[PDB]
Structure 1
Amino acid sequence: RFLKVKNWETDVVLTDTLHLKSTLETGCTEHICMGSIMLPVRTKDQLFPLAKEFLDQYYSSIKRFGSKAHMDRLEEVNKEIESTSTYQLKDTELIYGAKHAWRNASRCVGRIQWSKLQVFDARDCTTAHGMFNYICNHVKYATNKGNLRSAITIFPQRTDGKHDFRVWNSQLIRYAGYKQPDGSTLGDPANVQFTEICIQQGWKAPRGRFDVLPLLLQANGNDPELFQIPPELVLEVPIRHPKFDWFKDLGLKWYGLPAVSNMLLEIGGLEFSACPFSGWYMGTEIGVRDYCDNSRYNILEEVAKKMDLDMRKTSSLWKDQALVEINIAVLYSFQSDKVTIVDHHSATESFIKHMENEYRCRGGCPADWVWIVPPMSGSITPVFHQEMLNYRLTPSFEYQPDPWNTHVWKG
């Protein structure tokens, strides 16, 4: 079966056939679309089909499908599953696996960059202290003094689900949040719950607006341990505006390295429960969501006040006006300090080109419109006008429950 998507601005039509190699479910049916829903151990039994399908993809990509080397690898994985109830990926398979999970990430606008991903194999790690060391090297290599490079670090896979490696942090670098007894929050409201855990585990909190959280690291199913990232490794950017001199006096800064550490990497049925990956920021992630979400730093009010906007009625578009100024500020600050960043116009245009290229080379590009369209200025970016097909391919990144909800405390 063939499927077409149309671009309503340019009238380009593309044909998707890749959706035919699609495994997992969407959440939708014939009678319901769950397109806007945010969230819609294995036996040998289910493991060998997933192993084989992965190895068939792998051996196609290297043009060795059906070769002696292909068949022996199959037989060897087969034996290893039936013998040990699991198996080990080679280096090369791991690398290809990790690239493809990224390539298959339908909610990622940054995928033009998928083939350049530094993969660090941390599958020999056994302790939290080891995890800390791998992460520090990740952060240093990725940061690269402002010239950001994509990378992922991959810790040992799940086995019985009782020995999991987890990074309790949702991102490697993120600011604390402290709910005050008057109901207001100091610092980032998103991170209040995690911050408390940290305090519980023995972190002495500076209790300021921009405190980098400590790493909370679980190895081999053990209780997690606190570690401070060395501040010399945390690249940060003070926020100023190119025309508004009072902007700096708002006291804002942000970190340069976005590094997501709570997702699950699935490759050939194996589950990598700690696989922090990092790239660089699209400006609107900071200036729209991080600063302007009502449930975040929410600075729209203060910025609007200082711009002396008419705030007495929403139809003045004072929110809209302040939001753009803040986003101009974020891009200006990052560029002036030479820290890699991409604006939403440039990021969405690159993605359109990637997507077409993917239809040509691969037969499709799965994509989630709800996520790919930027949280401001939607229709003046080319993605808004692009029809997109959403389906799940493996390898992939998946959500997993928060570890504090599932962890069995050894004490």
Structure 2
Amino acid sequence: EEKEILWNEAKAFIAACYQELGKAAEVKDRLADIKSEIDLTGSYVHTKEELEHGAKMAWRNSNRCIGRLFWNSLNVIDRRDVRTKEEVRDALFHHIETATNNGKIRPTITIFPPEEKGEKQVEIWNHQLIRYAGYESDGERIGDPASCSLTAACEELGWRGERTDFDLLPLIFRMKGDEQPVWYELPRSLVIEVPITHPDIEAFSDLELKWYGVPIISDMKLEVGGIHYNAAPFNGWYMGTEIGARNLADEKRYDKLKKVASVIGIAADYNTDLWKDQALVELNKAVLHSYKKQGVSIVDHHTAASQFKRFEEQAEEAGRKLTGDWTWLIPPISPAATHIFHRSYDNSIVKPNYFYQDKPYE
């Protein structure tokens, strides 16, 4: 079954991919080569063109992603050649620097060797390459609560955080053949961060909030024609609400709304005052203003939705079915002000795609 699952996926992927690249005539021979290779080796190797286009199709099929208009401009870095942890580390450093691009963020994915027989060659522990640590002890909470378990795992391995609210977690990954992951401190010169200020409320800086410029998801498996790239970190730029309405606002994250209410000079006493809503809007305004002021790429939820509308129109024009997850596409600030809220989406899963996988710790 396992080898048969592989061939079926390979057949479906190669037809669709070559069809899109105008290479339909080459499908027959390529499929022949692939079948022999699966018979001989138990797997097959993608061409660079297949791998690149596979990564792009996977983004295009990501139901939960509002940013999909730009799927075809994904920058694909092929690192299937990596064999050592120094090579992994340096490829990750390189991804951070080239994706960041001095603030003009380039959507990028770095693809490491795929799983062999469900056996990982490189097992990444970080949820994102750049992420803040989190600590909870004796009632005391510091940093990002969502990082508590990885943070504890890093410290078990000899790392120590400074216990500010914004400690950068080190990169941490394990190589096939090692019992323990290794970790490396992020060079601060690689990491752009944005202090959060407000366009007209001077006191807002008293909160001393910041966030990192580039979100680089490093814990998802990219699947392309039956090949499982468990290690394939990718980035885009942020939609403002991810930071203002969730990372900084959620009670189980940085939980800043009451503090926001205070500095913008409103009472946080009555539900009917909609103080949480007002705080959310001002904090979200501050986040967009701060990123733009620093020349770091970001998109507001209105502009992102307008772009997504164009993505929908583009799918229809190309004769491709559109899939989407309504519950994730709607922004968490004023969702009914976007077209998304007022229509429905087929949440069917199409491959290539990005998938969750179990974490290697806990």
TM-score category, normalised to shorter length: over 0.9
Q: Does 1:48 align with 2:4?
A: no
Q: Write the distance in 2 (CA, Å) between the matches of 1:311 and 1:205.
A: 33
Q: Which amino acid aligns with 1:77?
A: I
Q: Does 1:63 align with 2:19?
A: no
1:228: Cα distance to partner? 1.3
2:273 — aligned with what?
A: 316
List 4+ stretches of structure 1 deviating above 3 A. none
Paired with 1:166 and 1:47, the residues of 2 have a C-alpha distance of: 22
Which position in structure 1 is the counterpart of 2:123? 166
Matched residues in 2 for 1:309 and 1:390: separation? 41
> Do 1:151 and 1:278's aligned partners in 2 also have CA atoms closer than 8 Å?
yes
**Aligned counterparts of 2:263 and 2:299: Cα–Cα separation in 1:** 27
Q: 2:193 aligns with which of 215, 222, 236?
A: 236
Which of the residues 192, 197, 211 maps onto 2:148? 192
1:206 equivalenced with 2:152 (yes/no):
no
| Aligned match of 1:383 | 340
Match of 2:233 in 1: 276
Residue 313 of structure 2, aligned match among 356, 360, 370: 356
For the 8 Å contact 2:129–2:216, the answer to whether it is kept is yes
Instruction: Please identify, of 104-113 and 51-60, the stretch whose mean Cα deviation from structure 2 is larger.
Output: 51-60
- Measure, in 2, the Cα distance between the counterparts of 1:292 and 1:363: 37
Q: Secondary structure at the match of 1:246?
A: helix
Listed one character per residue, the Cα deviations across residues 380-408 of structure 1 (whole Å, up to 9, x for unaligned) are 12211122211111101011011114xxx
Residue of 73, 91, 99 corresponding to 1:142: 99
**What amino acid is aligned across from residue 336 of structure 1 in structure 2?**
K
Give matches, 1:25-36, under 5 Å. none
- State the shift of 1:219 in Å: 2.1
CA contact (8 A) 1:126 1:220 kept: no
Per-residue CA deviation, residues 60-104 of structure 1 (Å, 9 max, x unaligned), is 112232x2x322211111011011111111111000100000000
The answer to whether the 8 A contact 1:239-1:248 is kept is yes
- Tell me if structure 2 keeps the 8 A contact 1:127–1:220: no
- Identify the range of structure 1 (107-116 vs 376-385) with the bigger mean alpha-carbon deviation: 376-385
| Counterpart selection for 2:286 from 323, 329, 338 | 329
Could you tell me which runs of 5 or more consecutive residues in structure 2 were left unpaired when the two chains were aligned. Answer: none
Deviates more, 1:104-113 or 1:376-385: 376-385
User: Pairwise mapping of residues 168-183 of structure 1 onto structure 2 (< 5 A)?
Assistant: 168-181=125-138, 183=139
1:128–1:224 Cα contact (<8 Å) kept? no
RMSD between superposed Cα atoms in Å: 1.2
Distance 2:35 2:58 in 1: 23
Instruction: Check the 8 A contact 2:120/2:230 in 1, yes or no.
Output: no
1:112 is aligned to 69
Counterpart secondary structure, 2:290: helix
Task: Give the gaps of 5 or more residues in structure 1.
Answer: 1-41, 406-411
Structure-1-length-normalised TM-score: 0.86
Instruction: Tell me: CA distance 1:285–1:328, structure 2 relative to 1, closer, same or farther (3 Å).
Output: same
Taking the aligned partners of 1:133 and 1:312, their CA distance within structure 2 comes to 51
Structure 2 match to 1:255: 212
Greater Cα shift, 213-222 or 364-373: 213-222
Residues 130 and 215 in structure 2, CA contact (< 8 A), matched pair in contact too = yes
Structure 2 Cα separation of the partners of residues 162 and 369 of structure 1: 34
Amino acid of the structure 2 residue aligned with 1:331 = L
User: What's the CA shift for 1:221?
Assistant: 5.0
Contact 1:103–1:111, Cα closer than 8 Å, also in 2: yes
User: Is the 1:349–1:383 Cα contact (8 Å) retained in structure 2?
Assistant: no
CA distance in 2, matches of 1:121, 1:259: 16
How far apart, in 1, do the equivalents of 2:177 and 2:332 lie?
38
What is the distance in 2 between the residues matched to 1:268 and 1:97?
Answer: 8
**TM-score normalised by L of structure 2:** 0.97
- 3-state SS in 2 of match to 1:265: strand
Q: Work out whether residues 220 and 354 of structure 2, in 8 Å CA contact, stay in contact via their aligned partners in 1.
A: yes
User: Which of 78, 85, 91 in structure 1 is aligned with 2:35?
Assistant: 78
> Cα distance 1:99–1:221, how it changes in 2: closer, same or farther (>3 A)?
farther
Query: Is 1:292 paired with 2:267?
Result: no
Look up the SS of the partner of 1:312 in the other structure. Answer: coil
- Whole-angstrom distance in 2 between the partners of 1:339 and 1:305: 28
CA distance in 1, matches of 2:245, 2:254: 10
Structure 2 residue identity aligned to 1:213: L
